[PDB]
Amino acid sequence: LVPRGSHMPPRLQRFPATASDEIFAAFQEDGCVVIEGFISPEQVARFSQEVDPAMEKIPVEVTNGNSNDRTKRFSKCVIASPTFRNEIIESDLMHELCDRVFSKPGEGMGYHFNDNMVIEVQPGAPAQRLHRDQELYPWWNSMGPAGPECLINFFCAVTPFTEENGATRLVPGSHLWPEFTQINERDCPQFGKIETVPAMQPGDCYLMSGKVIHGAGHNATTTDRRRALALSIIRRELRPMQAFSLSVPMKLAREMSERSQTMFGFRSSHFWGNDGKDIAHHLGLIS
Amino acid sequence: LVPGSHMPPRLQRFPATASADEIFAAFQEDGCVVIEGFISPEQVARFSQEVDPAMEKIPVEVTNNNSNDRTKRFSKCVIASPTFRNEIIESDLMHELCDRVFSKPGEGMGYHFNDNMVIEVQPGAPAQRLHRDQELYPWWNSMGPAGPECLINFFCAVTPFTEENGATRLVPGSHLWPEFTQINERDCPQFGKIETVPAIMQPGDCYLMSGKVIHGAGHNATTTDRRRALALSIIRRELRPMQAFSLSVPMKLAREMSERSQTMFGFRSSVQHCVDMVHFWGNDGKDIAHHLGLI
Ligand SMILES: C=C1[C@@]2(C)CC3=C(C)[C@]4(C=CC(=O)OC4(C)C)CC[C@]3(C)[C@]1(C(=O)OC)C(=O)[C@@](C)(O)C2=O
Ligand SMILES: C=C1[C@@]2(C)CC3=C(C)[C@]4(C=CC(=O)OC4(C)C)CC[C@]3(C)[C@]1(C(=O)OC)C(=O)[C@@](C)(O)C2=O
Ligand SMILES: O=C(O)CCC(=O)C(=O)O
Ligand SMILES: O=C(O)CCC(=O)C(=O)O
Ligand SMILES: [Fe+3]
Ligand SMILES: [Fe+3]
DSSP states (O other): OOOTTSOOOOOOOEEETTOOOHHHHHHHHHSOOEEETSSOHHHHHHHHHHHHHHHHTOOOBOOOOOTTBTEEEEOOHHHHOHHHHHTGGGOHHHHHHHHHHTOOTTSOOOEEEEEEEEEEEOTTOOOOOOEEGGGGSTTGGGGGGGSOOOEEEEEEESSOOOTTTTOEEEETTGGGOSSOOOSSTTTOTTTTOOOOEEOOOTTOEEEEETTOEEEEOOOOOSSOOEEEEEEEEEETTBOOSBOHHHHSOHHHHTTSOHHHHHHTTSSOOOTTBBTTBOHHHHHTOOO | OOOOOOOOOOOOEEETTSOHHHHHHHHHHHSEEEEETSSOHHHHHHHHHHHHHHHHTSOOOOOOOOOOOSEEEEOOHHHHOHHHHHTGGGOHHHHHHHHHHHOOTTTOOOEEEEEEEEEEEOTTOOOOOOBOGGGGSTTGGGGGGGSOOOEEEEEEESSOBOTTTTOOEEOTTGGGOSSOOOSSTTTOTTTTOOOOEEOOBOTTOEEEEETTSOEEOOOOOOSSOOEEEEEEEEEETTBOOSBOHHHHSOHHHHHTSOHHHHHHHTSSOEEEEOOOEEEETBBTTBOHHHHHTOO
């Protein structure tokens, strides 16, 4: 795999979207894993064109070290794209995976959606700061690698992921380090020695844990809009960064299955209920 | 007080006109503090009157178990009570203390509502298991006493709280024990040896309590006394509420709310800073209040 004698780089396993528990142990051991072909070939295609009109009406910032410097972001994927709401979010591998990360026996679905983002790294965009996704829930790093999982991300490539256009540089095994710190020169002892691994073709995805260090690289090209679809998924006890049950129209919620209504907060798991009853009753969604 | 009689733990008491700093320091020392006249007796009585039809229509569950039985719980306080939504949730002392607990520099409101629950302990109802309210967020005990706060409770007396009718039993300074476990025989070594103290209160008194404080409803030993409480459960912005208030509370009521009341119920977002900024509970980069028409 490496020339004999070489420094071996951090292991980044890769499974086919038809694999089994097998993908999960790669997640447990490394903190991430690639699912090659996560979304079908025409599915990803129909999806990208469907959000191209919305992506077109996002002006680009040319700035300050923020994650908005020449990186454009858009989250109304259920509204804008029939392919997303009808096909992509009903992956049984997605759910069979989430149930192994999040759900406890007897309690139903321990998870729901945090965000559905399309991230498009514009050419010349500086490399994104290194971070753990779970910094979104600021106390979580304090629990170290023994803490439970709060967040996972099915990070899917829309346009191809190269080392040129700044695909995500992962750091496998970052979830097993003994202290979880901010990744900067004052707080991180290993800053500048952190060994990355860049991450894929359209429809491939990687299933990253919230504990894993990562970040978008510099998009060094002149023409490449590098586009992605992040399926952020949190445990049921945590609050979504998107208010999906207030912006997704009721017309679309009626077309979703019970699992997908639970993912978007149109149905309870009790958490997110309505005075001892499922919020789905009051909304006109049960029997 | 008592006669070399053994003296129980101290539960500090303040009037609602004390300084939120004096109250907060007490809360920090003991993890719980009584605020007398948190709500005026005229406010508490109108509230009790406005929820009472809903309370009477709630059947009492009697069971053959320790099942947390014979306790009515009602959460649609905003819909049923003009006093609650117009006055009680507008307590400036409530928001002063919440900020000192939850709100970060340069982010605005770090908290929102988990629940608004009328809890009426029926005559004869058995005592509740000792618990910490942050057990609702099961990973929280594992951070121990150094952990951040996830939840505080403004537990108000609607009818008098007495030692006989089931006033809550609290364990002051249990937010400072070095290991947070569930309170059971397997996991808790002080099990059965834990000294509680009732929250004796008159109508309109609150106690403010951290999610780190061991406590439990007491046994209601009376035959006539339906012991009514109002629990204002308040969590940090990154945590999920028990109630989906933005989906059951009507928009007509949303539009009459102050901006900070809208934030409490999820009709409006809160800006969190990480280099980056993110409207938590937002709409693709903007406040959810825009798509809702709340300006
Ligand atoms: C299921 C329960 C949970 C898990 C959560 C809880 C919540 C949210 C409460 C506790 C925390 C809080 O701050 O708010 C209130 C007051 C409303 C009380 C009521 C319930 C819903 C609960 C219950 O109903 O048991 C039948 C319960 O009594 C208790 C204590 O055992 C629980 O820890
Ligand atoms: C404000 C940001 C936060 C705080 C959260 C975040 C979310 C939720 C994301 C990250 C984690 C996740 O699990 O999902 C996604 C992919 C959607 C990415 C986009 C943003 C909104 C964020 C950002 O865009 O900054 C304006 C950002 O890039 C990052 C990484 O710096 C952040 O940690
Ligand atoms: O866009 C990328 O390459 C990674 C972005 C990411 O993971 C984030 O925004 O948190
Ligand atoms: O009603 C009480 O006195 C305590 C209730 C309580 O602690 C709870 O329900 O979580
Ligand atoms: Fe990230
Ligand atoms: Fe409690």
